[PDB]
Symmetry: C2
Subunit: 48 residues, 2 copies
Amino acid sequence: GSERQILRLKQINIQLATKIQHLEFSCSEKEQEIERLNKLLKQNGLLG
Amino acid sequence: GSERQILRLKQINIQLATKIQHLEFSCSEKEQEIERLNKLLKQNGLLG
């Protein structure tokens, strides 16, 4: 009944919240990778 | 009673499922930028 429907909604909820946490962490790591590449470009005279 | 959780979880999960799509796009855009910077650095002798 409703108890089981609730449990399943909570499992889906945690799966979605975990994927969000992963994608926020992956986006942050990629912005750090972009900073590091841009700094290398700057140093080699490729960013003005 | 307990059943009021059903709507709350359903609605949260719709919001989270949408946010995952927006974060997937943000992550993909950052990956394309990293590929672009890697190629620039390679063309310029700087990626090994």
